[PDB]
């Protein structure tokens, strides 16, 4: 059935190379592209880079591509694998590599084959990809569930000037009745925000960060949040749009404490916050703003700070760098009551099967799952089908700007259209989209 | 045989709606997404926008989509057209509309059908799209020619704060031996530029505009160009990277004069330049920098200035605003010897046949053709296959950032790989790509 496996270098949305895999069967040629994060969690599966400073700023993926072409491909073609059996596909890939963190072959060599295999399988079954992914995950299909998009609108933190410590501010049109409506009203908030931002901060603050949000020089979280509320009001959608945060607090964690002025080299060490103090800051925000989700409020191994905040949070708390889409870390997060939602990034773990397992483990513990892009994305639309397949009710895949983001959101429009009356929009029920009836 | 024509609303790279068309035949379903264009203006084909301020900021395409679904579709399917006959497809669409500027049905409605048909045609012929497009254009196929990418790196004019009057600064890796090498060395130059820009102008100057270039607050053409030269040198590619400009001088044309300080509201009239004075500035830039192409050096109707400059320019002069991909304007520009290259925007004319014809007329006059993106692009890769089909040697499709830009550049990588020894890179011969042997 699988007659050829092939990899090439292509460019991601930041202009860095990444791995593209093609798998050939009797049904044709199936393409998958591997995304790439920035400042990746210490516990992420290995993204293999060449480190040749004379090529691509040291960011080549020739070694990973060669691992697909020269290592995986001939073994895989000769293994006679049934692509419909994703578990077998991934058991085979994992066994070749033989390392816990996929450092022998690279997670970016393994994932492309893993994903392409599922695309070939959907074609063999003559079903759209989301239907096949629902099969793999054993999700309920009457109805299917369309996700609330968590749309990045404003960018802070590492990639941003100003003193704004928190990294992502998202809007979530939970009040919409359909995905199409959600994306329309979201886009309208975005345009109002871009307009407000250019008027208040100058023409250049209207330019966008890696995920398509505006990135003005903002001083505080309150300034950013007041700006967003203004955009929601101006677009006329007050009451229909909620807010999500990704704090990316690992970026400002220094020896036990949290430096909210970490962009300032002469930061006052005596002003760095403890776990409980930072949690106080979040509660202050949650009281003044319609915040329904907070991601990585504390650092990637700061278990105690997570568990403490979770007792009284009362809103969705999303694990990203804490859990790294890794069932082993998710088990720890569940036991410790650290969070109540998984940010699912297939390339943090390296296979579709492990990713599906991570989602299933989360759902089983009463957690939600927010399927996620990476900050370096591509024209690949896999995660749009994956979020529907997993029935999660929520995705973050960027601002409604830059087509590595729109490709996913557009694919959701297509899936919504196709599904017709056998789909429902998760809306206010996004957190438990998987249990929505 | 076409059994179905269908349209839906999707989002472009700026978060504005655009038309997506699907044409169904026995070979399957074939999709086109149209870039954004103009809904008002002289000489160019007009896309249809809804103008409902309560939806999508007035930029809905529901009417255009309806025109496809309720008008074009039933008549098109009924007419039983041979999709391989692109001329007949386009004559049919043009006739149904009945207006010179496609304003009855919308250029967006028409173009979507035009393009989807060529994809269906390629499939019927069992050839890649670029091969079918070469057939339609009667271009030479031994070898095929891969284009030099003119990569946007830096924007000024109305696309930035500061005083920089000129709009676009591009790099052209003419010194590369393959398209793959050209894109690699181009991305390295861009990263170095992004790095230098953030160091010299602050972190926010690293945010990207619509087409992926940076927009720091720059004072002069010289300052921008010195910055680009530094980036080229830092990447190690001096001698291999050339520069293209888009002056967009229509933006700073007031009276019969050119105001290089147009962003200053108290700008000093009488410091404004005549044609010949502006030509002196371009000449001084040409002596100091490796500029091989200048787009829109003079205003869209200032024919005498264009013709005067062209006599002694000695480098590629590209018509954009002057010609607006309009056959009558092109003929005039050819006769007046105003320029020697056409910026070809398929959605500015509205059909593939007319786009191809405009290119052929340019080539017949010894002009080059630069296939061009739009500000609002999509994940659709059509123009990558078009530039190859037209054998032009040059494409302008954005910075190596944002995937509406990278989708095209990636598709060119794939096309190059597929063609192998059947293709050559245009390199230094970009201007006469079509005549290259
Ligand atoms: Mg090795
Ligand atoms: Mg099923
Ligand atoms: Mg995160
Ligand atoms: Mg041919
Ligand atoms: Mg122009």
Coordinates of C-alpha atoms and ligand atoms in Angstrom, one line a residue, chain B residues 167-168 246 248 295-296 320-321 343 345 396, ligand 5:
Chain B
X167 CA 7.2 52.1 -0.7
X168 CA 9.0 48.8 -1.2
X246 CA 8.8 50.0 -5.8
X248 CA 4.8 53.9 -5.7
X295 CA 8.7 50.0 -10.2
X296 CA 6.4 53.0 -10.6
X320 CA 2.3 48.7 -11.9
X321 CA -0.1 51.6 -11.2
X343 CA 3.7 43.8 -13.1
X345 CA -1.8 40.9 -11.2
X396 CA 7.2 39.2 -6.6
Ligands
LIG5 MG1 3.7 48.8 -6.9

